[PDB]
Amino acid sequence: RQQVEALQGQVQHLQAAFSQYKKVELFPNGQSVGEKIFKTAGFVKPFTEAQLLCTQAGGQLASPRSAAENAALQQLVVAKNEAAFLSMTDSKTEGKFTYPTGESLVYSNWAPGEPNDDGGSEDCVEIFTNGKWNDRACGEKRLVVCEF
Amino acid sequence: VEALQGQVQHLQAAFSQYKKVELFPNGQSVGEKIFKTAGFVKPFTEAQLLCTQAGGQLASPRSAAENAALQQLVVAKNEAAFLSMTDSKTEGKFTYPTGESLVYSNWAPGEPNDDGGSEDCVEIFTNGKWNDRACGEKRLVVCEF
Amino acid sequence: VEALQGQVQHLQAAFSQYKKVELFPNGQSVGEKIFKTAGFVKPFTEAQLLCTQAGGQLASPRSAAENAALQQLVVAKNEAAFLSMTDSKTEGKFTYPTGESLVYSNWAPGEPNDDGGSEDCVEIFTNGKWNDRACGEKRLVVCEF
Ligand SMILES: OC[C@H](O)[C@H]1O[C@H](O)C[C@@H](O)[C@@H]1O
Ligand SMILES: OC[C@H](O)[C@H]1O[C@H](O)C[C@@H](O)[C@@H]1O
Ligand SMILES: OC[C@H](O)[C@H]1O[C@H](O)C[C@@H](O)[C@@H]1O
Ligand SMILES: [Ca+2]
Ligand SMILES: [Ca+2]
Ligand SMILES: [Ca+2]
Ligand SMILES: [Ca+2]
Ligand SMILES: [Ca+2]
Ligand SMILES: [Ca+2]
Ligand SMILES: [Ca+2]
Ligand SMILES: [Ca+2]
Ligand SMILES: [Ca+2]
Protein backbone atom coordinates (compact mmCIF):
# COMPACT_ATOMS: atom_id res chain seq x y z
CA ARG A 1 0.00 0.00 0.00
CA GLN A 2 2.57 2.55 1.18
CA GLN A 3 4.76 2.05 -1.89
CA VAL A 4 1.64 2.61 -4.00
CA GLU A 5 0.56 5.87 -2.36
CA ALA A 6 3.79 7.84 -2.87
CA LEU A 7 4.23 6.12 -6.24
CA GLN A 8 0.96 7.74 -7.34
CA GLY A 9 2.39 11.12 -6.41
CA GLN A 10 5.52 10.47 -8.46
CA VAL A 11 3.52 9.41 -11.50
CA GLN A 12 1.24 12.44 -11.17
CA HIS A 13 4.30 14.69 -11.05
CA LEU A 14 5.76 13.10 -14.19
CA GLN A 15 2.44 13.44 -16.01
CA ALA A 16 2.12 17.14 -15.15
CA ALA A 17 5.76 17.86 -15.94
CA PHE A 18 5.54 15.91 -19.19
CA SER A 19 2.36 17.70 -20.28
CA GLN A 20 4.20 20.98 -19.85
CA TYR A 21 7.33 19.88 -21.69
CA LYS A 22 5.37 18.54 -24.66
CA LYS A 23 4.09 22.06 -25.29
CA VAL A 24 7.55 23.56 -24.80
CA GLU A 25 9.11 21.06 -27.19
CA LEU A 26 6.60 21.65 -30.00
CA PHE A 27 7.05 25.43 -29.90
CA PRO A 28 7.67 26.66 -32.59
CA ASN A 29 8.78 23.90 -34.97
CA GLY A 30 6.38 21.08 -34.18
CA GLN A 31 2.71 20.13 -34.44
CA SER A 32 0.82 17.35 -32.69
CA VAL A 33 -2.23 15.81 -34.34
CA GLY A 34 -3.80 12.70 -32.90
CA GLU A 35 -0.92 10.41 -31.95
CA LYS A 36 1.34 11.82 -34.67
CA ILE A 37 3.91 14.60 -34.33
CA PHE A 38 5.31 16.63 -37.22
CA LYS A 39 8.56 18.49 -36.71
CA THR A 40 10.44 20.61 -39.19
CA ALA A 41 14.22 20.82 -39.36
CA GLY A 42 13.77 24.41 -40.49
CA PHE A 43 15.85 24.11 -43.66
CA VAL A 44 15.53 22.74 -47.20
CA LYS A 45 17.09 19.64 -48.79
CA PRO A 46 16.59 17.43 -51.86
CA PHE A 47 14.27 14.44 -51.35
CA THR A 48 16.85 11.70 -50.82
CA GLU A 49 18.74 13.77 -48.25
CA ALA A 50 15.53 14.80 -46.49
CA GLN A 51 14.33 11.20 -46.43
CA LEU A 52 17.62 10.05 -44.89
CA LEU A 53 17.54 12.71 -42.17
CA CYS A 54 14.08 11.55 -41.08
CA THR A 55 14.84 7.84 -41.23
CA GLN A 56 18.05 8.24 -39.23
CA ALA A 57 16.11 10.22 -36.63
CA GLY A 58 13.74 7.31 -36.06
CA GLY A 59 10.87 8.72 -38.10
CA GLN A 60 10.03 9.35 -41.75
CA LEU A 61 9.08 12.18 -44.07
CA ALA A 62 5.73 13.86 -43.42
CA SER A 63 2.97 11.49 -44.52
CA PRO A 64 -0.43 13.15 -43.96
CA ARG A 65 -3.13 10.45 -43.94
CA SER A 66 -6.12 12.70 -43.27
CA ALA A 67 -7.34 16.26 -43.69
CA ALA A 68 -6.56 16.94 -40.02
CA GLU A 69 -2.98 15.73 -40.42
CA ASN A 70 -2.61 17.71 -43.64
CA ALA A 71 -3.81 20.87 -41.88
CA ALA A 72 -1.29 20.37 -39.08
CA LEU A 73 1.52 19.97 -41.60
CA GLN A 74 0.26 23.01 -43.50
CA GLN A 75 0.70 25.12 -40.34
CA LEU A 76 4.44 24.40 -40.29
CA VAL A 77 4.73 25.04 -44.02
CA VAL A 78 2.96 28.39 -43.57
CA ALA A 79 5.06 29.35 -40.53
CA LYS A 80 8.30 28.82 -42.46
CA ASN A 81 6.74 30.00 -45.72
CA GLU A 82 8.45 27.10 -47.49
CA ALA A 83 6.75 24.24 -49.34
CA ALA A 84 7.78 20.85 -47.93
CA PHE A 85 8.38 17.36 -49.27
CA LEU A 86 6.01 14.54 -48.35
CA SER A 87 7.24 10.95 -48.05
CA MET A 88 5.26 9.60 -51.00
CA THR A 89 6.60 8.93 -54.51
CA ASP A 90 5.68 7.08 -57.69
CA SER A 91 9.29 6.15 -58.46
CA LYS A 92 8.45 2.44 -58.61
CA THR A 93 5.43 2.67 -60.92
CA GLU A 94 4.77 5.95 -62.74
CA GLY A 95 1.34 7.33 -61.92
CA LYS A 96 0.94 5.33 -58.72
CA PHE A 97 2.03 7.14 -55.57
CA THR A 98 2.82 5.11 -52.47
CA TYR A 99 4.09 5.52 -48.92
CA PRO A 100 7.62 4.27 -48.11
CA THR A 101 5.97 0.95 -47.22
CA GLY A 102 4.55 0.49 -50.70
CA GLU A 103 0.97 1.02 -49.56
CA SER A 104 -1.23 3.17 -51.81
CA LEU A 105 -2.46 6.54 -50.53
CA VAL A 106 -5.42 6.67 -48.13
CA TYR A 107 -5.65 10.45 -48.52
CA SER A 108 -4.52 13.09 -51.02
CA ASN A 109 -5.01 16.81 -51.53
CA TRP A 110 -3.77 17.35 -55.08
CA ALA A 111 -4.07 20.79 -56.63
CA PRO A 112 -6.25 20.68 -59.77
CA GLY A 113 -4.52 18.84 -62.62
CA GLU A 114 -1.90 17.25 -60.37
CA PRO A 115 -0.02 14.96 -60.40
CA ASN A 116 1.08 15.74 -63.96
CA ASP A 117 4.63 14.32 -64.05
CA ASP A 118 5.77 17.60 -65.62
CA GLY A 119 8.67 17.15 -68.02
CA GLY A 120 8.17 13.44 -67.52
CA SER A 121 10.27 13.67 -64.37
CA GLU A 122 8.30 14.45 -61.19
CA ASP A 123 8.15 11.50 -58.79
CA CYS A 124 8.11 13.30 -55.45
CA VAL A 125 5.41 15.37 -53.75
CA GLU A 126 5.42 18.86 -52.24
CA ILE A 127 2.79 20.58 -50.12
CA PHE A 128 2.18 24.30 -50.68
CA THR A 129 1.36 26.97 -48.12
CA ASN A 130 -2.28 26.59 -49.19
CA GLY A 131 -2.17 22.94 -48.17
CA LYS A 132 -2.47 21.57 -51.70
CA TRP A 133 -0.18 18.93 -53.18
CA ASN A 134 1.89 18.97 -56.35
CA ASP A 135 4.24 16.33 -57.75
CA ARG A 136 7.74 17.74 -58.10
CA ALA A 137 11.21 16.66 -59.21
CA CYS A 138 12.89 14.84 -56.34
CA GLY A 139 16.10 16.75 -57.06
CA GLU A 140 14.54 20.05 -56.00
CA LYS A 141 15.10 21.36 -52.47
CA ARG A 142 12.11 21.64 -50.13
CA LEU A 143 11.46 22.16 -46.42
CA VAL A 144 12.33 19.07 -44.38
CA VAL A 145 9.49 17.94 -42.12
CA CYS A 146 9.54 14.57 -40.40
CA GLU A 147 6.78 12.72 -38.59
CA PHE A 148 7.22 10.75 -35.37
CA VAL B 1 4.77 -2.59 -7.38
CA GLU B 2 8.40 -3.69 -7.57
CA ALA B 3 9.17 -3.63 -11.30
CA LEU B 4 6.87 -0.61 -11.51
CA GLN B 5 9.02 1.26 -9.00
CA GLY B 6 12.02 0.60 -11.22
CA GLN B 7 10.22 2.02 -14.25
CA VAL B 8 9.14 5.20 -12.47
CA GLN B 9 12.71 5.69 -11.22
CA HIS B 10 14.07 5.30 -14.73
CA LEU B 11 11.52 7.78 -16.05
CA GLN B 12 12.50 10.40 -13.47
CA ALA B 13 16.14 10.11 -14.51
CA ALA B 14 15.38 10.06 -18.23
CA PHE B 15 12.93 12.94 -17.93
CA SER B 16 15.38 15.08 -15.98
CA GLN B 17 18.06 14.61 -18.65
CA TYR B 18 15.54 15.34 -21.41
CA LYS B 19 14.40 18.55 -19.72
CA LYS B 20 17.94 19.93 -19.74
CA VAL B 21 18.33 19.02 -23.41
CA GLU B 22 15.04 20.70 -24.33
CA LEU B 23 15.84 23.98 -22.58
CA PHE B 24 19.22 24.30 -24.29
CA PRO B 25 19.63 26.91 -25.71
CA ASN B 26 16.25 28.61 -26.17
CA GLY B 27 14.54 27.94 -22.85
CA GLN B 28 14.63 29.04 -19.22
CA SER B 29 13.03 27.35 -16.23
CA VAL B 30 12.11 29.38 -13.15
CA GLY B 31 9.89 27.93 -10.45
CA GLU B 32 7.07 26.06 -12.20
CA LYS B 33 7.28 28.32 -15.26
CA ILE B 34 9.18 27.79 -18.50
CA PHE B 35 10.02 30.56 -20.97
CA LYS B 36 10.96 29.59 -24.52
CA THR B 37 11.90 31.82 -27.41
CA ALA B 38 11.00 31.10 -31.03
CA GLY B 39 14.24 32.77 -32.07
CA PHE B 40 12.57 35.28 -34.39
CA VAL B 41 10.64 38.55 -34.24
CA LYS B 42 6.96 39.26 -34.93
CA PRO B 43 4.47 42.06 -34.31
CA PHE B 44 2.46 41.66 -31.09
CA THR B 45 -0.77 40.23 -32.50
CA GLU B 46 1.11 37.53 -34.41
CA ALA B 47 3.41 36.76 -31.48
CA GLN B 48 0.38 36.49 -29.20
CA LEU B 49 -1.37 34.09 -31.57
CA LEU B 50 1.72 31.89 -31.86
CA CYS B 51 1.90 31.47 -28.09
CA THR B 52 -1.84 30.87 -27.70
CA GLN B 53 -1.88 28.26 -30.48
CA ALA B 54 1.07 26.54 -28.78
CA GLY B 55 -0.97 26.17 -25.61
CA GLY B 56 0.80 28.94 -23.73
CA GLN B 57 0.89 32.73 -23.70
CA LEU B 58 3.38 35.54 -24.23
CA ALA B 59 6.06 35.91 -21.54
CA SER B 60 4.44 37.31 -18.40
CA PRO B 61 7.09 37.86 -15.70
CA ARG B 62 5.36 38.13 -12.32
CA SER B 63 8.42 38.53 -10.09
CA ALA B 64 12.02 39.71 -10.13
CA ALA B 65 13.06 36.06 -10.41
CA GLU B 66 10.93 35.45 -13.49
CA ASN B 67 12.03 38.72 -15.04
CA ALA B 68 15.68 37.75 -14.58
CA ALA B 69 15.11 34.38 -16.27
CA LEU B 70 13.36 36.03 -19.22
CA GLN B 71 16.14 38.61 -19.41
CA GLN B 72 18.69 35.84 -19.98
CA LEU B 73 16.93 34.81 -23.19
CA VAL B 74 16.72 38.41 -24.36
CA VAL B 75 20.44 38.88 -23.70
CA ALA B 76 21.30 35.60 -25.41
CA LYS B 77 19.48 36.59 -28.60
CA ASN B 78 20.33 40.27 -28.16
CA GLU B 79 16.76 41.13 -29.15
CA ALA B 80 14.19 42.91 -26.98
CA ALA B 81 11.05 40.81 -26.52
CA PHE B 82 7.32 41.42 -26.17
CA LEU B 83 5.56 40.75 -22.88
CA SER B 84 1.90 39.65 -22.79
CA MET B 85 0.61 42.76 -21.03
CA THR B 86 -1.16 45.71 -22.66
CA ASP B 87 -3.25 48.74 -21.77
CA SER B 88 -5.34 48.43 -24.93
CA LYS B 89 -8.58 48.23 -22.94
CA THR B 90 -7.99 51.24 -20.69
CA GLU B 91 -5.14 53.62 -21.50
CA GLY B 92 -2.71 53.92 -18.61
CA LYS B 93 -3.72 50.60 -17.06
CA PHE B 94 -1.65 47.58 -18.07
CA THR B 95 -3.14 44.14 -17.55
CA TYR B 96 -2.47 40.47 -18.25
CA PRO B 97 -4.45 38.67 -20.99
CA THR B 98 -6.96 37.77 -18.26
CA GLY B 99 -7.75 41.40 -17.46
CA GLU B 100 -5.99 41.09 -14.11
CA SER B 101 -3.80 44.02 -13.00
CA LEU B 102 -0.01 43.73 -12.75
CA VAL B 103 1.38 42.08 -9.61
CA TYR B 104 4.91 43.05 -10.67
CA SER B 105 6.53 45.62 -12.97
CA ASN B 106 10.05 46.68 -13.93
CA TRP B 107 9.53 49.84 -15.97
CA ALA B 108 12.52 51.82 -17.20
CA PRO B 109 12.65 55.42 -15.88
CA GLY B 110 9.76 57.50 -17.19
CA GLU B 111 7.92 54.51 -18.65
CA PRO B 112 5.23 53.77 -19.60
CA ASN B 113 4.86 57.03 -21.55
CA ASP B 114 2.44 56.13 -24.37
CA ASP B 115 4.84 57.78 -26.83
CA GLY B 116 3.05 59.34 -29.78
CA GLY B 117 -0.19 58.47 -28.03
CA SER B 118 0.16 54.98 -29.46
CA GLU B 119 2.11 52.51 -27.29
CA ASP B 120 -0.09 49.82 -25.77
CA CYS B 121 2.30 46.87 -25.74
CA VAL B 122 5.40 46.21 -23.63
CA GLU B 123 8.95 45.21 -24.52
CA ILE B 124 11.71 44.02 -22.19
CA PHE B 125 15.27 45.22 -22.87
CA THR B 126 18.55 43.36 -22.47
CA ASN B 127 18.93 45.18 -19.15
CA GLY B 128 15.67 43.63 -17.99
CA LYS B 129 13.78 46.92 -17.84
CA TRP B 130 10.38 47.43 -19.49
CA ASN B 131 9.19 50.00 -22.01
CA ASP B 132 5.75 50.44 -23.57
CA ARG B 133 6.03 50.17 -27.34
CA ALA B 134 3.77 50.27 -30.40
CA CYS B 135 2.15 46.86 -30.85
CA GLY B 136 2.86 47.05 -34.57
CA GLU B 137 6.61 46.89 -34.01
CA LYS B 138 8.43 43.56 -34.31
CA ARG B 139 10.07 42.02 -31.23
CA LEU B 140 11.52 38.68 -30.13
CA VAL B 141 8.80 36.09 -29.55
CA VAL B 142 9.01 34.43 -26.14
CA CYS B 143 6.21 32.27 -24.78
CA GLU B 144 5.65 30.88 -21.31
CA PHE B 145 4.37 27.43 -20.41
CA VAL C 1 -2.88 -0.48 -8.58
CA GLU C 2 -3.31 -1.78 -12.13
CA ALA C 3 -4.26 1.81 -12.94
CA LEU C 4 -0.78 3.17 -12.21
CA GLN C 5 0.73 0.30 -14.18
CA GLY C 6 -1.18 1.26 -17.30
CA GLN C 7 -0.42 4.95 -16.90
CA VAL C 8 3.33 4.32 -16.62
CA GLN C 9 3.37 2.16 -19.76
CA HIS C 10 1.71 4.92 -21.74
CA LEU C 11 4.04 7.49 -20.20
CA GLN C 12 7.05 5.47 -21.39
CA ALA C 13 5.60 5.33 -24.89
CA ALA C 14 4.77 9.04 -25.03
CA PHE C 15 8.15 9.96 -23.56
CA SER C 16 9.98 7.82 -26.11
CA GLN C 17 8.21 9.60 -28.97
CA TYR C 18 8.97 13.05 -27.58
CA LYS C 19 12.61 12.08 -27.10
CA LYS C 20 12.97 11.33 -30.83
CA VAL C 21 11.20 14.59 -31.67
CA GLU C 22 13.49 16.52 -29.33
CA LEU C 23 16.70 15.25 -30.93
CA PHE C 24 15.62 16.10 -34.48
CA PRO C 25 17.61 17.78 -35.93
CA ASN C 26 20.06 19.26 -33.42
CA GLY C 27 20.72 16.33 -31.12
CA GLN C 28 22.36 12.91 -31.11
CA SER C 29 22.03 10.17 -28.51
CA VAL C 30 24.81 7.64 -27.98
CA GLY C 31 24.69 5.24 -25.06
CA GLU C 32 23.34 7.21 -22.09
CA LYS C 33 24.83 10.46 -23.40
CA ILE C 34 23.08 13.13 -25.46
CA PHE C 35 24.84 15.74 -27.60
CA LYS C 36 22.92 18.87 -28.57
CA THR C 37 24.11 21.83 -30.59
CA ALA C 38 23.06 25.43 -29.97
CA GLY C 39 23.26 26.05 -33.70
CA PHE C 40 25.71 28.94 -33.40
CA VAL C 41 29.41 29.60 -32.78
CA LYS C 42 31.09 31.12 -29.72
CA PRO C 43 34.59 31.43 -28.24
CA PHE C 44 35.53 28.64 -25.81
CA THR C 45 34.92 30.39 -22.48
CA GLU C 46 31.48 31.55 -23.61
CA ALA C 47 30.62 28.13 -25.04
CA GLN C 48 31.77 26.43 -21.85
CA LEU C 49 29.64 28.76 -19.74
CA LEU C 50 26.53 28.13 -21.86
CA CYS C 51 26.87 24.39 -21.34
CA THR C 52 27.61 24.58 -17.63
CA GLN C 53 24.67 26.91 -17.01
CA ALA C 54 22.44 24.47 -18.90
CA GLY C 55 23.44 21.71 -16.50
CA GLY C 56 25.80 19.93 -18.85
CA GLN C 57 29.26 20.47 -20.29
CA LEU C 58 30.98 20.90 -23.64
CA ALA C 59 31.04 17.81 -25.86
CA SER C 60 33.48 15.27 -24.40
CA PRO C 61 33.69 12.19 -26.66
CA ARG C 62 35.22 9.34 -24.66
CA SER C 63 35.08 6.63 -27.34
CA ALA C 64 35.04 6.10 -31.10
CA ALA C 65 31.27 5.60 -30.86
CA GLU C 66 30.73 8.91 -29.07
CA ASN C 67 33.06 10.69 -31.47
CA ALA C 68 31.10 9.36 -34.44
CA ALA C 69 27.82 10.55 -32.94
CA LEU C 70 29.24 14.03 -32.35
CA GLN C 71 30.69 14.02 -35.86
CA GLN C 72 27.15 13.67 -37.24
CA LEU C 73 26.13 17.03 -35.75
CA VAL C 74 29.29 18.75 -36.96
CA VAL C 75 28.74 17.36 -40.47
CA ALA C 76 25.05 18.33 -40.37
CA LYS C 77 25.87 21.92 -39.44
CA ASN C 78 29.08 21.89 -41.50
CA GLU C 79 30.85 23.74 -38.68
CA ALA C 80 33.80 22.55 -36.57
CA ALA C 81 32.91 22.38 -32.87
CA PHE C 82 34.75 22.88 -29.58
CA LEU C 83 35.30 19.95 -27.24
CA SER C 84 35.54 20.42 -23.46
CA MET C 85 39.21 19.49 -23.11
CA THR C 86 42.16 21.87 -22.73
CA ASP C 87 45.83 21.83 -21.81
CA SER C 88 45.78 25.27 -20.18
CA LYS C 89 47.06 23.89 -16.87
CA THR C 90 49.97 21.91 -18.30
CA GLU C 91 51.01 22.51 -21.91
CA GLY C 92 50.81 19.30 -23.93
CA LYS C 93 48.58 17.51 -21.43
CA PHE C 94 44.90 17.72 -22.36
CA THR C 95 42.30 17.09 -19.69
CA TYR C 96 38.55 17.08 -19.12
CA PRO C 97 37.03 19.91 -17.02
CA THR C 98 37.47 17.69 -13.96
CA GLY C 99 41.22 17.50 -14.49
CA GLU C 100 41.22 13.85 -15.56
CA SER C 101 43.54 12.87 -18.44
CA LEU C 102 42.08 11.82 -21.81
CA VAL C 103 40.82 8.23 -22.11
CA TYR C 104 40.34 8.63 -25.87
CA SER C 105 41.67 10.92 -28.59
CA ASN C 106 41.30 11.26 -32.35
CA TRP C 107 43.99 13.78 -33.28
CA ALA C 108 44.37 14.58 -36.97
CA PRO C 109 47.86 13.84 -38.33
CA GLY C 110 50.40 16.28 -36.89
CA GLU C 111 48.14 17.33 -34.01
CA PRO C 112 48.23 18.59 -31.35
CA ASN C 113 50.93 21.04 -32.43
CA ASP C 114 50.28 24.12 -30.25
CA ASP C 115 50.65 26.16 -33.41
CA GLY C 116 51.50 29.80 -32.80
CA GLY C 117 52.52 28.85 -29.28
CA SER C 118 48.97 29.23 -28.01
CA GLU C 119 46.42 26.53 -28.88
CA ASP C 120 44.99 25.13 -25.67
CA CYS C 121 41.48 24.22 -26.79
CA VAL C 122 40.27 21.43 -29.07
CA GLU C 123 38.01 21.39 -32.10
CA ILE C 124 36.48 18.48 -33.99
CA PHE C 125 36.32 18.69 -37.79
CA THR C 126 33.61 17.43 -40.14
CA ASN C 127 35.85 14.41 -40.72
CA GLY C 128 35.74 13.63 -37.01
CA LYS C 129 39.43 14.30 -36.41
CA TRP C 130 40.68 16.64 -33.67
CA ASN C 131 42.89 19.71 -33.79
CA ASP C 132 44.15 21.91 -30.97
CA ARG C 133 42.92 25.45 -31.56
CA ALA C 134 43.25 28.89 -29.94
CA CYS C 135 40.54 29.18 -27.30
CA GLY C 136 39.66 32.67 -28.53
CA GLU C 137 38.43 31.42 -31.90
CA LYS C 138 34.72 30.84 -32.46
CA ARG C 139 33.45 27.32 -33.05
CA LEU C 140 30.10 25.51 -33.04
CA VAL C 141 28.68 25.13 -29.53
CA VAL C 142 27.77 21.53 -28.71
CA CYS C 143 26.95 20.42 -25.18
CA GLU C 144 26.53 16.94 -23.74
CA PHE C 145 23.92 15.92 -21.17
O1 LIG D 1 5.23 20.75 -60.89
C1 LIG D 1 5.01 21.58 -62.02
C2 LIG D 1 3.54 22.04 -62.04
O2 LIG D 1 2.68 20.91 -62.20
C3 LIG D 1 3.28 22.93 -63.24
O3 LIG D 1 3.52 22.12 -64.49
C4 LIG D 1 3.32 22.87 -65.79
O4 LIG D 1 4.46 23.63 -65.94
C5 LIG D 1 1.84 23.45 -65.85
C6 LIG D 1 1.59 24.36 -64.57
O5 LIG D 1 0.22 24.89 -64.64
C7 LIG D 1 1.76 23.46 -63.27
O6 LIG D 1 1.55 24.24 -62.10
O1 LIG E 1 8.92 53.85 -26.51
C1 LIG E 1 9.51 55.12 -26.77
C2 LIG E 1 10.40 55.54 -25.58
O2 LIG E 1 9.62 55.69 -24.40
C3 LIG E 1 11.04 56.90 -25.83
O3 LIG E 1 9.94 57.93 -25.97
C4 LIG E 1 10.39 59.35 -26.24
O4 LIG E 1 10.67 59.40 -27.59
C5 LIG E 1 11.38 59.82 -25.09
C6 LIG E 1 12.59 58.78 -24.97
O5 LIG E 1 13.48 59.25 -23.90
C7 LIG E 1 12.00 57.36 -24.61
O6 LIG E 1 13.04 56.40 -24.49
O1 LIG F 1 45.55 24.79 -35.62
C1 LIG F 1 46.44 24.97 -36.72
C2 LIG F 1 46.58 23.63 -37.49
O2 LIG F 1 47.18 22.66 -36.66
C3 LIG F 1 47.53 23.79 -38.67
O3 LIG F 1 48.90 24.14 -38.15
C4 LIG F 1 49.98 24.32 -39.19
O4 LIG F 1 49.77 25.59 -39.69
C5 LIG F 1 50.10 23.00 -40.07
C6 LIG F 1 48.67 22.65 -40.69
O5 LIG F 1 48.82 21.42 -41.49
C7 LIG F 1 47.66 22.40 -39.50
O6 LIG F 1 46.37 22.09 -40.01
CA1 LIG G 1 8.77 8.45 -63.02
CA1 LIG H 1 5.82 10.73 -61.68
CA1 LIG I 1 3.47 18.70 -60.97
CA1 LIG J 1 -4.00 53.32 -26.13
CA1 LIG K 1 -0.75 53.07 -23.87
CA1 LIG L 1 7.53 54.05 -24.19
CA1 LIG M 1 49.52 26.80 -23.60
CA1 LIG N 1 48.53 23.87 -26.04
CA1 LIG O 1 46.71 22.73 -34.08
Side-chain angles (χ1 to χ4, degrees):
Chain A
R1 175 190 174 184
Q2 180 183 179
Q3 300 184 182
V4 177
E5 179 63 54
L7 191 52
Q8 297 180 301
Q10 296 190 307
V11 170
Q12 181 168 48
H13 174 73
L14 285 170
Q15 296 175 307
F18 186 61
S19 178
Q20 176 184 52
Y21 273 80
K22 288 188 288 178
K23 295 182 182 66
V24 174
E25 162 57 46
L26 295 173
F27 179 67
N29 301 305
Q31 285 294 313
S32 177
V33 53
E35 298 186 299
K36 175 176 289 186
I37 294 173
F38 288 117
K39 185 174 182 182
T40 182
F43 52 72
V44 303
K45 293 289 185 177
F47 181 79
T48 302
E49 285 168 48
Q51 179 178 63
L52 186 57
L53 287 174
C54 294
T55 298
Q56 298 185 310
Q60 63 171 42
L61 278 168
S63 310
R65 298 173 68 87
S66 74
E69 292 194 347
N70 200 69
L73 176 59
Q74 176 185 11
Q75 293 181 56
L76 291 177
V77 172
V78 167
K80 303 298 176 301
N81 191 48
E82 289 288 336
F85 269 132
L86 301 186
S87 73
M88 309 83 84
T89 79
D90 72 327
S91 298
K92 184 175 180 179
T93 300
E94 177 57 40
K96 180 183 177 181
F97 285 77
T98 65
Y99 298 109
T101 61
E103 156 185 43
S104 67
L105 310 186
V106 300
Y107 171 84
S108 65
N109 194 33
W110 302 111
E114 306 298 342
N116 68 352
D117 195 46
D118 190 60
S121 61
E122 299 188 315
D123 293 357
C124 283
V125 185
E126 72 180 320
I127 175 172
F128 299 132
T129 54
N130 69 351
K132 294 292 175 180
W133 301 4
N134 172 48
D135 57 330
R136 173 71 60 178
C138 300
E140 296 302 298
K141 300 184 175 185
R142 292 294 185 276
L143 185 71
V144 183
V145 184
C146 306
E147 61 173 40
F148 298 97
Chain B
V1 64
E2 187 70 302
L4 181 61
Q5 205 173 306
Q7 297 183 306
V8 176
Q9 249 51 62
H10 167 272
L11 282 174
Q12 292 189 341
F15 182 63
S16 186
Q17 176 187 49
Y18 153 84
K19 291 193 289 180
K20 292 194 286 184
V21 176
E22 164 53 41
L23 299 178
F24 181 68
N26 303 306
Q28 278 296 322
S29 178
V30 54
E32 298 180 57
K33 178 176 289 185
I34 293 176
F35 288 120
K36 185 178 180 181
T37 182
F40 55 71
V41 302
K42 293 289 187 182
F44 179 82
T45 298
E46 290 180 51
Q48 182 180 61
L49 187 61
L50 283 176
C51 295
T52 295
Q53 298 180 311
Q57 62 176 53
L58 280 166
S60 311
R62 289 166 172 281
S63 71
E66 298 198 336
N67 206 74
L70 175 58
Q71 187 186 347
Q72 305 185 194
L73 289 175
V74 173
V75 173
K77 306 308 171 184
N78 193 49
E79 287 296 321
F82 270 129
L83 299 189
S84 72
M85 308 83 89
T86 79
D87 74 328
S88 296
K89 182 180 179 180
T90 302
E91 179 56 39
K93 184 180 180 179
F94 285 79
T95 65
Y96 299 108
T98 58
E100 169 184 49
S101 300
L102 303 184
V103 300
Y104 168 83
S105 67
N106 193 43
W107 300 110
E111 308 297 346
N113 69 349
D114 196 49
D115 191 55
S118 58
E119 297 189 317
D120 292 3
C121 283
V122 184
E123 68 178 318
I124 176 174
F125 299 131
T126 54
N127 61 21
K129 295 294 179 179
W130 303 0
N131 171 45
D132 55 332
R133 178 70 64 177
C135 300
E137 294 299 298
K138 299 180 183 62
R139 293 293 185 275
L140 185 70
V141 178
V142 183
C143 304
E144 60 171 44
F145 299 95
Chain C
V1 302
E2 180 65 59
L4 290 174
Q5 180 62 58
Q7 296 181 301
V8 172
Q9 299 289 268
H10 302 320
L11 242 184
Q12 283 185 174
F15 176 70
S16 183
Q17 176 186 43
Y18 273 84
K19 177 173 172 53
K20 293 196 293 185
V21 173
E22 168 70 49
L23 300 177
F24 179 71
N26 302 306
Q28 282 296 305
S29 62
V30 53
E32 299 187 307
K33 174 176 291 184
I34 295 176
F35 289 121
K36 183 175 182 184
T37 183
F40 54 75
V41 304
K42 291 288 187 179
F44 180 80
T45 302
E46 287 174 52
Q48 179 182 62
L49 184 61
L50 286 174
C51 295
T52 58
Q53 298 183 309
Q57 57 176 36
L58 279 167
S60 305
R62 298 175 68 92
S63 73
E66 297 198 338
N67 203 73
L70 175 62
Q71 183 182 357
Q72 292 185 57
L73 289 178
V74 177
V75 168
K77 313 292 291 185
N78 192 53
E79 287 295 313
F82 270 129
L83 299 187
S84 73
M85 309 84 89
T86 75
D87 72 330
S88 295
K89 180 177 180 180
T90 302
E91 178 53 38
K93 181 174 183 176
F94 288 79
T95 62
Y96 301 109
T98 61
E100 160 189 44
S101 292
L102 302 183
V103 301
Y104 167 82
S105 66
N106 195 41
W107 300 111
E111 308 302 341
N113 60 14
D114 200 43
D115 191 275
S118 57
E119 297 192 316
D120 302 348
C121 281
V122 183
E123 69 174 321
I124 176 173
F125 298 134
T126 56
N127 63 20
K129 294 298 181 178
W130 302 2
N131 171 50
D132 54 331
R133 170 71 57 185
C135 299
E137 294 302 298
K138 300 172 182 296
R139 292 294 185 275
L140 187 70
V141 181
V142 184
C143 306
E144 62 173 39
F145 303 90

